[PDB]
Short mmCIF file of C-alpha atoms in Angstrom, two decimals:
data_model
loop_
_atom_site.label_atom_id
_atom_site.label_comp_id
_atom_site.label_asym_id
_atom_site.label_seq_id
_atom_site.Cartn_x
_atom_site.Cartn_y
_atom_site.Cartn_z
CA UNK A 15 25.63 11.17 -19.29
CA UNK A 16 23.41 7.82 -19.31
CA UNK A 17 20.56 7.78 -17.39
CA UNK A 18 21.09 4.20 -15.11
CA UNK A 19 18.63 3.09 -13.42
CA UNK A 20 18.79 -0.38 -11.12
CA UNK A 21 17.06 -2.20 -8.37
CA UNK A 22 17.26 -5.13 -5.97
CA UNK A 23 14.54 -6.51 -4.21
CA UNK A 24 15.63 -8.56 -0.67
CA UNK A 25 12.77 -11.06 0.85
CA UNK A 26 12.02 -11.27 4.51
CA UNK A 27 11.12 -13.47 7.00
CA UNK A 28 8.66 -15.80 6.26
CA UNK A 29 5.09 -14.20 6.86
CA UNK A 30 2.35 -17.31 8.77
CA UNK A 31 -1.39 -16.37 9.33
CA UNK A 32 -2.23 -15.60 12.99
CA UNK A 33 -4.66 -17.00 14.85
CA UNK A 34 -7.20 -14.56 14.12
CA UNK A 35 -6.85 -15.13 10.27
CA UNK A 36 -4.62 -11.64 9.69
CA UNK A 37 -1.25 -11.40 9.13
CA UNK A 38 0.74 -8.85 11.92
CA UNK A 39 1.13 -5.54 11.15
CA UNK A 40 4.79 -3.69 10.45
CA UNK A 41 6.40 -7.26 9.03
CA UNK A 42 9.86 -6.34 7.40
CA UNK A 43 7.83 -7.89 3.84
CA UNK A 44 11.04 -7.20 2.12
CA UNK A 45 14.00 -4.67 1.39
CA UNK A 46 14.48 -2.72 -1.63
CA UNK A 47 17.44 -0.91 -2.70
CA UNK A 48 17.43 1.94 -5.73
CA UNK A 49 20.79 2.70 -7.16
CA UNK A 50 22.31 3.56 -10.78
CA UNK A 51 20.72 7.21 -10.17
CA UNK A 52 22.68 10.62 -10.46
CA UNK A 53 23.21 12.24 -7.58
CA UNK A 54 19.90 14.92 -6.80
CA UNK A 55 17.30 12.57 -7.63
CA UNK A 56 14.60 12.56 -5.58
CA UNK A 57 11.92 11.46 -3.25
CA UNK A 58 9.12 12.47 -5.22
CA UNK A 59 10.69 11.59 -8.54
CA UNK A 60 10.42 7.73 -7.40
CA UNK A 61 6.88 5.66 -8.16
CA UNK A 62 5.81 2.28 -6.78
CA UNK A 63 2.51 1.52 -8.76
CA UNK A 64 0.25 -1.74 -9.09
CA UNK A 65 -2.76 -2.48 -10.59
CA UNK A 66 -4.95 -2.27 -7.77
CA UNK A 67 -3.68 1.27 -7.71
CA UNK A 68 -4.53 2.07 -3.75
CA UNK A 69 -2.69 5.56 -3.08
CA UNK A 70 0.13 5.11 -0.44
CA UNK A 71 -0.26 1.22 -0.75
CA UNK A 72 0.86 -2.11 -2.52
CA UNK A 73 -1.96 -4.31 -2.81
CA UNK A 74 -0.99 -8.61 -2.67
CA UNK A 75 -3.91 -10.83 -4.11
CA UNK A 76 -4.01 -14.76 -3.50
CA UNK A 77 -3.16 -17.07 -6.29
CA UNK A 78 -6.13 -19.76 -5.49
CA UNK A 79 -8.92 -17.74 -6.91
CA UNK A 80 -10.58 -16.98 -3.68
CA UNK A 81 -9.26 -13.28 -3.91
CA UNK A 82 -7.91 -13.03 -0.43
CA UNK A 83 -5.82 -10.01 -0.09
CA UNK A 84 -3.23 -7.79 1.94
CA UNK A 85 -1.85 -4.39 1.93
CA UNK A 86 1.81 -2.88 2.50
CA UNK A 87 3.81 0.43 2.49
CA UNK A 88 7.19 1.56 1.44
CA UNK A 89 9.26 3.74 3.61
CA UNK A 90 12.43 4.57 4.26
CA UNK A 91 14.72 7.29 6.10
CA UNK A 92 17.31 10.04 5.19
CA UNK A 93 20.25 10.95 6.74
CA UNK A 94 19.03 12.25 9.62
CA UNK A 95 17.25 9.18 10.00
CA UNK A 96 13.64 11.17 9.45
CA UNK A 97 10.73 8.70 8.13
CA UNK A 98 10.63 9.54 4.33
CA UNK A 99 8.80 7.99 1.02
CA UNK A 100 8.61 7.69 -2.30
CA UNK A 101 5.34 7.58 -4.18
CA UNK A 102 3.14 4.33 -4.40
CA UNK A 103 0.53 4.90 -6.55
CA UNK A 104 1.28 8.40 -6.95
CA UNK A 105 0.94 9.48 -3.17
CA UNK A 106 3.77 9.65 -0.13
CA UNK A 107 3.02 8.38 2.64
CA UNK A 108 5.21 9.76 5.26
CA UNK A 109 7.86 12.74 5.40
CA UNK A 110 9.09 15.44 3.50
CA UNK A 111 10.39 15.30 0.00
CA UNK A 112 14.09 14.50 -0.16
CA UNK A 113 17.16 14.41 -2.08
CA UNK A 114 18.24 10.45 -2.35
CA UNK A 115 21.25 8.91 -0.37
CA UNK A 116 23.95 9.24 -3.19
CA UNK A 117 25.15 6.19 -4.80
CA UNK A 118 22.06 4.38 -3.36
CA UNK A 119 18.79 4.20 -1.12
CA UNK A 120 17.10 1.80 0.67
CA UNK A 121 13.14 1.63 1.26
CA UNK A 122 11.17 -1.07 3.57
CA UNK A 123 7.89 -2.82 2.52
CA UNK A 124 6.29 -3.28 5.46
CA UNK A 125 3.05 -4.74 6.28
CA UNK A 126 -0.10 -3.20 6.63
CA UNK A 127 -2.50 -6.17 6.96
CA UNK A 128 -5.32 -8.29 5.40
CA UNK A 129 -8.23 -6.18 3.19
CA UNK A 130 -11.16 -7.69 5.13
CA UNK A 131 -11.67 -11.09 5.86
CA UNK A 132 -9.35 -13.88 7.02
CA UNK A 133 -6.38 -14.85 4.72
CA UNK A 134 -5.87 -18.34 3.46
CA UNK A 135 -2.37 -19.61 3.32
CA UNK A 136 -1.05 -20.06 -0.11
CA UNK A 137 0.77 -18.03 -2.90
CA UNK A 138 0.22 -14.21 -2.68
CA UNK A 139 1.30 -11.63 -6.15
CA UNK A 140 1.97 -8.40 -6.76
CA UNK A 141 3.32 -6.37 -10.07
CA UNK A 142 5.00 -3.48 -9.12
CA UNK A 143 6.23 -1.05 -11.90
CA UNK A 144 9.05 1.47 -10.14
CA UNK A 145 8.86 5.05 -12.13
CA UNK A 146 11.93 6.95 -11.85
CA UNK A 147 10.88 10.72 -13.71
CA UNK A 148 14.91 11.91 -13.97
CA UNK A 149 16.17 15.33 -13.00
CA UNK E 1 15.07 -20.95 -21.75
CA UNK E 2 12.67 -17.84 -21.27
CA UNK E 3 9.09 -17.53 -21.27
CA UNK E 4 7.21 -14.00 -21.17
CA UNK E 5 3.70 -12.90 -20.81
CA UNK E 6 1.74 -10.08 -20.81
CA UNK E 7 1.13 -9.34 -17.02
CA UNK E 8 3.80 -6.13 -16.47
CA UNK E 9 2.71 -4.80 -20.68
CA UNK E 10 0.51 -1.66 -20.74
CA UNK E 11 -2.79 -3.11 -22.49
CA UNK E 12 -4.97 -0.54 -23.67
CA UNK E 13 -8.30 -1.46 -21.59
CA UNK E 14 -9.14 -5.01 -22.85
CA UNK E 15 -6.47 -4.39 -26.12
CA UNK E 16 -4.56 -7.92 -25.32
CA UNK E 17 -0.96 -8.13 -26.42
CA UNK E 18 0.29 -11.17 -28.08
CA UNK E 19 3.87 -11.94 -26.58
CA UNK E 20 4.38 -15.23 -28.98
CA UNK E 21 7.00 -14.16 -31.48
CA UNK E 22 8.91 -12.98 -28.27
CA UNK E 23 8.65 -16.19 -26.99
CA UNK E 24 10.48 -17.75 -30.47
CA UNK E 25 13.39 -15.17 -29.63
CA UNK E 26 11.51 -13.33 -32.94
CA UNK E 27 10.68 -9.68 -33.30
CA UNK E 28 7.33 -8.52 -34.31
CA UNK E 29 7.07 -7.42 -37.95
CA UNK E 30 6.54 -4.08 -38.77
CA UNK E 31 8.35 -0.59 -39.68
CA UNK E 32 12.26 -0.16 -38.43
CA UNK E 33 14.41 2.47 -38.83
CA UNK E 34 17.99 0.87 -39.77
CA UNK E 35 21.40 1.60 -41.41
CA UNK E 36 22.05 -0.54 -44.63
CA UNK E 37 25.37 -1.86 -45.42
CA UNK E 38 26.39 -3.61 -48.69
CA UNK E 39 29.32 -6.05 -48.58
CA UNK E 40 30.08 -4.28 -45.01
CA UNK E 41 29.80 -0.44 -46.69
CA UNK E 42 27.19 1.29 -45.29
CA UNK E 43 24.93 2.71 -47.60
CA UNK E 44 21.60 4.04 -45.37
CA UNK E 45 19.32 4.79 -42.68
CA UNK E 46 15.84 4.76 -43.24
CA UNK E 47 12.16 3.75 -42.66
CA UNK E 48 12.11 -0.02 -43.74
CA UNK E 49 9.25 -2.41 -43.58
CA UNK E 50 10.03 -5.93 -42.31
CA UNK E 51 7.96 -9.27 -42.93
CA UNK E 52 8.46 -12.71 -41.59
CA UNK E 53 9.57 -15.30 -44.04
CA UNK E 54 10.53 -18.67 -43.24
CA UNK E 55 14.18 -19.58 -44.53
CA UNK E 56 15.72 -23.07 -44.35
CA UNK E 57 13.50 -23.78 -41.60
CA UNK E 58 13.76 -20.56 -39.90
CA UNK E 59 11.65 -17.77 -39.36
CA UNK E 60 13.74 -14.19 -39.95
CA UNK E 61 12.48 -10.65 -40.89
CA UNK E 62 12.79 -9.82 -44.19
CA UNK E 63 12.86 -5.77 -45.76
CA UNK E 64 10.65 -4.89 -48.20
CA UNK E 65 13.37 -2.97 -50.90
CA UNK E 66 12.99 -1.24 -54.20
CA UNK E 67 14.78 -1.63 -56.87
CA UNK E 68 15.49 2.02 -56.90
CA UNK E 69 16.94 1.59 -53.14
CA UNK E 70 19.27 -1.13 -54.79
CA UNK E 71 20.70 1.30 -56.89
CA UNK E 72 20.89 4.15 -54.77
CA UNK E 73 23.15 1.38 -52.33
CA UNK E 74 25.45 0.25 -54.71
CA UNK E 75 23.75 -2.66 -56.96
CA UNK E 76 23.22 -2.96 -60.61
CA UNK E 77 19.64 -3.78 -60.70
CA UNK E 78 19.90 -4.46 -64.93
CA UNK E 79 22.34 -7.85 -63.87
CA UNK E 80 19.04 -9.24 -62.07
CA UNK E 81 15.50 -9.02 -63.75
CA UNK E 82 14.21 -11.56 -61.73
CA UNK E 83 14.17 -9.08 -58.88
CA UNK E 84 11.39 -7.42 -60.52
CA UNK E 89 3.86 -4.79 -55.00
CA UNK E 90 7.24 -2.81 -54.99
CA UNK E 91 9.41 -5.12 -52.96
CA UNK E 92 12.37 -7.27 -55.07
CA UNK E 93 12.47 -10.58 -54.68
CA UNK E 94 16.52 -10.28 -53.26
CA UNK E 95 16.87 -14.38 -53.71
CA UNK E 96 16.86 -13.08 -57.60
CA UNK E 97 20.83 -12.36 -56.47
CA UNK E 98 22.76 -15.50 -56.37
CA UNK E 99 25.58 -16.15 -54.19
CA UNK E 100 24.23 -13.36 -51.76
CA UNK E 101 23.37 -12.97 -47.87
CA UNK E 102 20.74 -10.97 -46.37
CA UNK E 103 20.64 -10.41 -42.77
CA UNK E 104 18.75 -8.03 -40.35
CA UNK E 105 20.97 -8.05 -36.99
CA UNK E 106 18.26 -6.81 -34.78
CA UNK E 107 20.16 -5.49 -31.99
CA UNK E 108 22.29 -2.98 -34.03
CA UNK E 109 19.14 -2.08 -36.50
CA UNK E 110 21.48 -2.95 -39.18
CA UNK E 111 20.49 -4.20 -42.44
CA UNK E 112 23.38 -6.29 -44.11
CA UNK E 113 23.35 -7.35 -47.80
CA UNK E 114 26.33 -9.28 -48.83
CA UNK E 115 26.09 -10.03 -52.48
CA UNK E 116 28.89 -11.35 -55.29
CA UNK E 117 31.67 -8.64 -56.18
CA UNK E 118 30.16 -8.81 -59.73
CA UNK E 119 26.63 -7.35 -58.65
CA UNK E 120 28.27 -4.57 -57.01
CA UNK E 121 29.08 -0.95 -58.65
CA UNK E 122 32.99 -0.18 -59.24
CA UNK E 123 34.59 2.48 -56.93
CA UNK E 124 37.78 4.15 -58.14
CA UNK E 125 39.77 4.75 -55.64
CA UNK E 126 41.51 3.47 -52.80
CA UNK E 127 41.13 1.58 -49.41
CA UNK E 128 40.02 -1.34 -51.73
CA UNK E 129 42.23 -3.03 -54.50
CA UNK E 130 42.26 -2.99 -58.39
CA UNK E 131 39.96 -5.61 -59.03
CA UNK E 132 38.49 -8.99 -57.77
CA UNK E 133 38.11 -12.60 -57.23
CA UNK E 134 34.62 -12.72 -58.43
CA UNK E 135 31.81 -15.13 -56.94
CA UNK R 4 23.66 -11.56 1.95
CA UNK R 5 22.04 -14.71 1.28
CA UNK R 6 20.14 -15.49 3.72
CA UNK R 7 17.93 -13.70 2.07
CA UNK R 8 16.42 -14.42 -1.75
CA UNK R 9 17.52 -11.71 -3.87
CA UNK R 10 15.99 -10.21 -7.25
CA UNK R 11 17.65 -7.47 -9.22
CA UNK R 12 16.43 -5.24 -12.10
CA UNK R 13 17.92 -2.54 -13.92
CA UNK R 14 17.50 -0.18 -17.20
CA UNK R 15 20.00 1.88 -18.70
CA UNK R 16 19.00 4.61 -21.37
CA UNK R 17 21.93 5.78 -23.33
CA UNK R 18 21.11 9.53 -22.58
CA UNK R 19 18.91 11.75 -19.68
CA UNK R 20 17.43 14.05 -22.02
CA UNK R 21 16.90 14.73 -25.29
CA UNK R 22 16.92 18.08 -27.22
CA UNK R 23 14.97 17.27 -29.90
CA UNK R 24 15.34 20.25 -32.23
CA UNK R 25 11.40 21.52 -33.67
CA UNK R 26 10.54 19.93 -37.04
CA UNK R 27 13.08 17.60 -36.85
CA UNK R 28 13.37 14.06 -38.76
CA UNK R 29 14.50 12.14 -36.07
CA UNK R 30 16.59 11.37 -33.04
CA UNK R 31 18.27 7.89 -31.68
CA UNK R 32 18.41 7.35 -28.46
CA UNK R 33 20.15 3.70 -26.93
CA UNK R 34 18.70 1.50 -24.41
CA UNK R 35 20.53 -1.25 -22.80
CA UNK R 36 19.51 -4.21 -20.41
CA UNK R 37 22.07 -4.40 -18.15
CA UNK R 38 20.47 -7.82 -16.64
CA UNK R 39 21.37 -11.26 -17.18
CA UNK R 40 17.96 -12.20 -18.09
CA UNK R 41 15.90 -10.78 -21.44
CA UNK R 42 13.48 -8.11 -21.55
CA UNK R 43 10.96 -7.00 -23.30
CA UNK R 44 11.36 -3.01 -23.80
CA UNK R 45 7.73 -1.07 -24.00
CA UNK R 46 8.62 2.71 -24.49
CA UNK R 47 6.09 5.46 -24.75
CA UNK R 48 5.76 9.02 -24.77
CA UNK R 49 3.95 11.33 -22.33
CA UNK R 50 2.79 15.15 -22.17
CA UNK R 51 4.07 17.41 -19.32
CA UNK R 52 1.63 16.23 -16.90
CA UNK R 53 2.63 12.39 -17.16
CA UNK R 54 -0.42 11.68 -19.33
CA UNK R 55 -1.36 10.35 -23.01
CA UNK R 56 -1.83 12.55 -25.78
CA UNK R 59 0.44 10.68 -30.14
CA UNK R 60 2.20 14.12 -31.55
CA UNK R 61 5.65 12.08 -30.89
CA UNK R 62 6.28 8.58 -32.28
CA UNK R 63 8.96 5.68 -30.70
CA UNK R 64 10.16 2.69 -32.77
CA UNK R 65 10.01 0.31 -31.93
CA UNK R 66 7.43 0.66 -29.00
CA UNK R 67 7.60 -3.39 -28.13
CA UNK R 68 10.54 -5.33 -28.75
CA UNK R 69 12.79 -7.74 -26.40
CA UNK R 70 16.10 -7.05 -25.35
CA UNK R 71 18.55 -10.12 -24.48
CA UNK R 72 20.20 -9.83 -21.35
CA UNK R 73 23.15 -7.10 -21.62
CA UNK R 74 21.99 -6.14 -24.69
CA UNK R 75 21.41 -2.87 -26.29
CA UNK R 76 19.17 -1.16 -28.89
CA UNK R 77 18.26 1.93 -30.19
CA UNK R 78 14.59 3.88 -30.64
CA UNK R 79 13.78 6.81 -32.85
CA UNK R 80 11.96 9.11 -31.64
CA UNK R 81 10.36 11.30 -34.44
CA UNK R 82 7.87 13.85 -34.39
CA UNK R 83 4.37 13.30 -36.07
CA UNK R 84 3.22 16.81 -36.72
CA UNK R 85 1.74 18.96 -33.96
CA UNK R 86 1.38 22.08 -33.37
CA UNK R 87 4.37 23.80 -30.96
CA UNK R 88 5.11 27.42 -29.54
CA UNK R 89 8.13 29.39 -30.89
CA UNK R 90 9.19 31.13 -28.42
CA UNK R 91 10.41 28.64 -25.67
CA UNK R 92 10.61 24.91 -25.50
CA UNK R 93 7.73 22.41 -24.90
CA UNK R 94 8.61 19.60 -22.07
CA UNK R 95 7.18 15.73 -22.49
CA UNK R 96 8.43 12.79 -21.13
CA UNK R 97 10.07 9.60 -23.07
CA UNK R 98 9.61 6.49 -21.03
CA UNK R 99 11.17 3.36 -21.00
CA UNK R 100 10.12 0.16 -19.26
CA UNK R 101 11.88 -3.42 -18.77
CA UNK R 102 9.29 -5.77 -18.39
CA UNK R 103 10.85 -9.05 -16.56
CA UNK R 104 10.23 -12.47 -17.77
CA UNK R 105 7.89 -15.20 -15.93
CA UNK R 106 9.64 -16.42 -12.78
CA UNK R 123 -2.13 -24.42 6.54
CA UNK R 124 -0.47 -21.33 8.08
CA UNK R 125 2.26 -19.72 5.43
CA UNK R 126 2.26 -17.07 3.22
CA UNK R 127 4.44 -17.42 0.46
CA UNK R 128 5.01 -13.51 -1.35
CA UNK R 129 5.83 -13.44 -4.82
CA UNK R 130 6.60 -10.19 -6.17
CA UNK R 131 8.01 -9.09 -9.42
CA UNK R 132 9.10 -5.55 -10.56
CA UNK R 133 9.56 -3.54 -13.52
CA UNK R 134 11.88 -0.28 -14.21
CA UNK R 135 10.32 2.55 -15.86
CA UNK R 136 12.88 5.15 -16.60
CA UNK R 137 12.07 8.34 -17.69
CA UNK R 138 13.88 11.33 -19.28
CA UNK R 139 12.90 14.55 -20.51
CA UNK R 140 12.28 15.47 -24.45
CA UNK R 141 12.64 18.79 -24.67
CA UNK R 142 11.25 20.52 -27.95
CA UNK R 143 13.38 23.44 -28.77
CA UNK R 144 11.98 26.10 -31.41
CA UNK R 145 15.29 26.87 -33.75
CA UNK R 146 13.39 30.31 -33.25
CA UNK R 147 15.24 30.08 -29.64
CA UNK R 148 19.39 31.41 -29.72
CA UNK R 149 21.36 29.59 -27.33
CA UNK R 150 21.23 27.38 -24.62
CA UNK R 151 20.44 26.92 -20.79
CA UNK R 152 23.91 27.63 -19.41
CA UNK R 153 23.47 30.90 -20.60
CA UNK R 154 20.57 32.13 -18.63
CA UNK R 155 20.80 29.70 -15.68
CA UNK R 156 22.43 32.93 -13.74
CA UNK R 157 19.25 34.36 -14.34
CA UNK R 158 16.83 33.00 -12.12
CA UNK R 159 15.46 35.46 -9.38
CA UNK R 160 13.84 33.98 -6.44
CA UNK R 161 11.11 35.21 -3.56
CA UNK R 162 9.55 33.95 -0.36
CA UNK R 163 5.44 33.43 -0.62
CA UNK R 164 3.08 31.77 1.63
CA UNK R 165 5.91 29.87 3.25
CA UNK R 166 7.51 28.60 -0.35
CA UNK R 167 10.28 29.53 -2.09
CA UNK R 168 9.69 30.67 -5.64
CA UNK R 169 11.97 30.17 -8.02
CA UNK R 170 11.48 33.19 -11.38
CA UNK R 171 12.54 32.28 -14.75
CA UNK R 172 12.59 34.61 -17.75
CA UNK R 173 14.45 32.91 -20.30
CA UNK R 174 12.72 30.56 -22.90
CA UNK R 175 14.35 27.65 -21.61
CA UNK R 176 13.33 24.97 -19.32
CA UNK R 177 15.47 25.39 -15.94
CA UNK R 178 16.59 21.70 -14.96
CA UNK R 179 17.49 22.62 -11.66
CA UNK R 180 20.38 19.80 -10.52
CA UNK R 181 20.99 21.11 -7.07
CA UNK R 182 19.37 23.63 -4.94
CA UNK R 183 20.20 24.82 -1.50
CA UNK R 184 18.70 27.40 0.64
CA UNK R 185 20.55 28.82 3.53
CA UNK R 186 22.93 26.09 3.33
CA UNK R 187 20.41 23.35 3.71
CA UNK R 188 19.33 21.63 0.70
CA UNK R 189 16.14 21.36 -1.48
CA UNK R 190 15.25 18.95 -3.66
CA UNK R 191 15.08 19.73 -7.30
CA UNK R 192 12.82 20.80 -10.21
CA UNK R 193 12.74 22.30 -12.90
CA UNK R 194 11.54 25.76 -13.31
CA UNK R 195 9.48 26.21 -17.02
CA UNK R 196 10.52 29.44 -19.50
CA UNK R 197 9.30 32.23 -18.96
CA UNK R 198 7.51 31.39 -15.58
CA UNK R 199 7.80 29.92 -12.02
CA UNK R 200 7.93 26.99 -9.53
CA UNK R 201 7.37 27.15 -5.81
CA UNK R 202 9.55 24.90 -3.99
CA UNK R 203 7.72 23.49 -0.76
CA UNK R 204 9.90 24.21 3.05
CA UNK R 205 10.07 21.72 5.61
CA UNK R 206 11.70 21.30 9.00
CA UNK R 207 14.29 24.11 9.54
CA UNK R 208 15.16 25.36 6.02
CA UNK R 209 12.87 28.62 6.34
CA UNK R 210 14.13 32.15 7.31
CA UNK R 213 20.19 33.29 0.04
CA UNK R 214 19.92 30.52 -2.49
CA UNK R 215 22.58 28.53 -4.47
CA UNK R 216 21.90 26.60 -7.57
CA UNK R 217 23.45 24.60 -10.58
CA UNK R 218 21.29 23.53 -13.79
CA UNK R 219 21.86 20.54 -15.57
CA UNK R 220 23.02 21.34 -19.02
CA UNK R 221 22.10 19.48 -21.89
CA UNK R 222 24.91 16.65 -21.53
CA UNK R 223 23.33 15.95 -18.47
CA UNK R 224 26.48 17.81 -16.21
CA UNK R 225 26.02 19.44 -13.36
CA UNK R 226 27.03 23.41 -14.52
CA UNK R 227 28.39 26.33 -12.87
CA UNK R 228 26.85 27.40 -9.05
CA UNK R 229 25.24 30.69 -9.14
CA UNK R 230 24.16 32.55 -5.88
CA UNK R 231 21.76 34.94 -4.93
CA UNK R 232 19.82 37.05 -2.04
CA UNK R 233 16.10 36.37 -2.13
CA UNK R 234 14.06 39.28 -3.08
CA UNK R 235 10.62 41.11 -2.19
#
C-alpha cells in the first residue's frame, strides 16, 4: 500500500491595509485541501511549520526589507462541524484530535493580524513545510 | 525551464547548500547504489561511486569500476589493457556505451559482442555479428 | 474553481512502512513526484521522538525528481546498537521541495510535503508478526484516558479504534508497554480495533470489555 500524500492550496480575496495600518482579523487568507491519505489519518498526525516557528501560527514577512509582518491560523471542522486543527508549528490550536474526512479535508488560513507596527503594502512570503507522520 | 534554490532545503545552521548542478538538470556526484546491466543483462547492485566528466560537450556521471567488477559482469578485461587509483578508464573499450539512467539507478554498459564472455545456452543465438 | 489561483503539491512514497529486518544490508524503498513540475527530494531519518540522532543511512539524501518521475533510496543501517527482544520505531522522511515560482497586500506562499513512514527494526530474535498478537491488546480506564496494554514485542499500529461505538483516533501502542488515548466530548463511560499489518492493510477487528 503506497503512502500518497497531496495538497492544493486555493488563494482568497485580495487582502488591502486598513486605515489604521493592520490588516482585519479572520480574512479567508486562503483554502487548503489534504488528500492522497489512507483513511484513519489524523488530526494530530498533520504539521504546518515555518521558519519563524510561532506555535499555533504561520508567520508572513514583507519582501522590501523593512521586515513588516503578519500572523495566521489554520483551522478547520469535522463532521459534526466542531472547530478542529492540525498542528502549526507543532501545537493545535483549537478542538479535539480527530480522525480526517476520508478521501479528503479541508483547513482555512485565516488571519490573525499585523506583529506590531503598521504594514506596508507590497509582497508578503511564507514557506510552509506540511508533515504528514503516517499511521 | 526550472530554477531551484535553497529556501524550503534543511541547512544545517549556517551549512549552505549549493543547488547548481540541480539547476543543469545534473545530479550531485557521490556514492549510488545501482543495478548494472551489460548489453541489457543485468549483472549487479551495488555501492558505486560516480564523478562528473564532461563528454562531447556534456557533463554526465561517470562510475568509478574495477577491473575485477568487469569480470565479475561479463567482460574480458585481458582484450583491453588500456583499461588499466583503481577505476578503468572504460573509453579503453571501443565501440561501447556507458550510461547512468538516473531515475532507474541503473548502470548500462553496452560494449561490442567480442568484449563480452560466451554463454552456452539458450534465449540468445549461436554466435554473432561482431562490432 | 478558478476564480481562485490554485497551487497543488503532492509526494508519493512507494510503501507506508518499512520492516527493516536487524543487521540487514539494505532496503529500497520508491518515491515518486506525482507533479507536473520537478522536485528536489531531501529524505532523512529520525528517532522515535521526531528528532536527529545517524545509526540509519538514505541514498541519496538530495537529488531532483522530474515531474512524474520516480526513484528509489536505500536505506541501510550504519551500525548501532538495538534491543532483541522487540522492535525499535524511527521515522523515514521524505520531502518535495518545490521550485522558485499603496494599500494591497499581495501573499505569496509556497509549500512543501514531508511524508513520513515508519522504519520498524525487527530483531530476527522476534517469531512472527503483528497480526498474530493484535487480539492481544487489553485495555483500562485511568484518569479519564483510555489505556491501551500491549505485551507482545511488536509495535501495535493501531488503524482504527472505536470506543463505545464512537471513534478514536489512532496510535500506535509500543511492545511490551502502553499508550493512553485522550477522551473528548461524549466518548467516555467496550473497545473495537484493527492493526495495520505490515502491507499497510487494515487487518481483522478484534473486540473487547475494558477491564479494572
Amino acid at each position: 500500500e503506497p503512502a500518497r500524500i497531496t495538497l492544493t492550496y486555493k488563494e482568497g480575496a485580495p487582502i488591502t491595509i486598513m486605515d489604521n495600518g493592520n490588516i482585519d482579523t479572520e480574512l479567508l487568507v486562503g483554502t487548503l485541501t489534504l488528500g492522497g491519505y489512507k483513511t484513519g489519518t489524523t488530526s494530530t498526525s498533520v504539521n504546518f511549520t515555518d521558519a519563524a516557528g510561532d506555535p499555533m501560527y504561520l508567520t508572513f514577512t514583507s519582501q522590501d526589507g523593512n521586515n513588516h509582518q503578519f500572523t495566521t491560523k489554520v483551522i478547520g471542522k469535522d463532521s459534526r462541524d466542531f472547530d478542529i486543527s492540525p498542528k502549526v508549528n507543532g501545537e493545535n490550536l483549537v478542538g479535539d484530535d480527530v480522525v480526517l474526512a476520508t478521501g479528503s479535508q479541508d483547513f482555512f488560513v485565516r488571519s490573525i493580524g499585523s506583529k506590531g507596527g503598521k504594514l506596508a503594502a507590497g509582497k508578503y512570503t511564507d514557506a510552509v513545510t506540511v508533515t504528514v507522520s503516517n499511521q | 525551464a526550472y530554477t531551484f534554490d535553497s529556501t524550503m532545503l534543511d541547512t544545517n545552521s549556517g551549512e549552505s547548500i549549493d543547488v547548481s548542478l540541480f539547476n543543469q538538470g545534473l545530479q550531485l556526484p557521490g556514492n549510488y547504489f545501482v543495478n548494472v546491466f551489460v548489453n541489457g543483462r543485468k549483472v549487479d547492485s551495488g555501492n558505486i561511486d560516480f564523478r562528473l566528466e564532461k563528454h562531447n560537450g556534456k557533463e554526465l556521471l561517470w562510475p568509478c569500476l574495477s577491473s575485477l567488477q568487469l569480470t565479475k559482469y561479463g567482460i574480458d578485461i585481458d582484450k583491453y589493457p588500456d583499461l588499466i587509483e583503481q577505476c578503468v578508464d572504460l573509453l579503453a573499450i571501443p565501440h561501447s556505451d556507458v550510461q547512468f539512467y538516473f531515475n532507474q539507478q541503473k548502470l548500462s554498459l553496452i560494449v561490442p559482442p567480442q568484449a563480452l564472455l560466451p554463454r552456452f545456452d539458450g534465449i540468445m543465438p549461436m554466435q554473432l555479428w561482431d562490432d | 474553481d478558478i476564480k481562485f489561483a490554485s497551487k497543488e503539491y503532492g509526494v508519493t512514497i512507494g510503501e507506508s512502512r518499512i520492516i527493516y529486518p536487524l543487521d540487514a544490508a539494505g532496503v529500497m524503498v520508491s518515491v515518486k513526484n506525482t507533479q507536473d513540475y520537478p522536485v528536489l527530494i531531501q529524505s532523512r531519518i529520525y528517532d522515535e521522538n521526531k528528532e536527529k540522532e545517524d545509526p540509519f543511512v538514505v541514498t541519496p539524501p538530495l537529488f531532483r525528481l522530474d515531474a512524474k518521475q520516480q526513484n528509489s533510496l536505500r536505506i541501510a543501517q550504519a551500525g548501532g546498537v538495538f534491543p532483541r527482544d522487540k522492535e525499535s520505531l524511527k521515522w523515514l522522511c521524505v520531502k518535495g521541495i518545490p521550485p522558485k515560482d499603496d494599500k494591497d497586500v499581495g501573499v505569496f506562499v509556497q509549500f512543501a510535503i514531508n511524508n513520513c513512514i515508519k522504519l520498524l527494526v525487527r530483531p530476527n530474535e522476534l517469531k512472527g508478526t503483528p497480526i498474530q498478537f493484535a487480539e492481544n491488546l487489553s485495555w483500562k480506564v485511568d484518569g479519564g484516558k483510555l489505556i491501551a496494554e500491549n505485551p507482545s514485542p511488536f509495535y501495535m499500529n493501531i488503524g482504527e479504534l472505536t470506543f463505545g461505538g464512537k471513534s478514536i483516533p489512532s496510535h500506535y501502542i509500543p511492545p511490551k508497554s502502553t499508550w493512553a488515548f485522550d477522551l473528548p466530548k461524549g466518548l467516555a463511560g467496550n473497545v473495537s480495533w484493527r492493526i495495520i499489518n505490515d502491507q499497510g492493510g487494515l487487518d481483522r477487528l478484534y473486540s473487547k470489555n475494558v477491564t479494572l
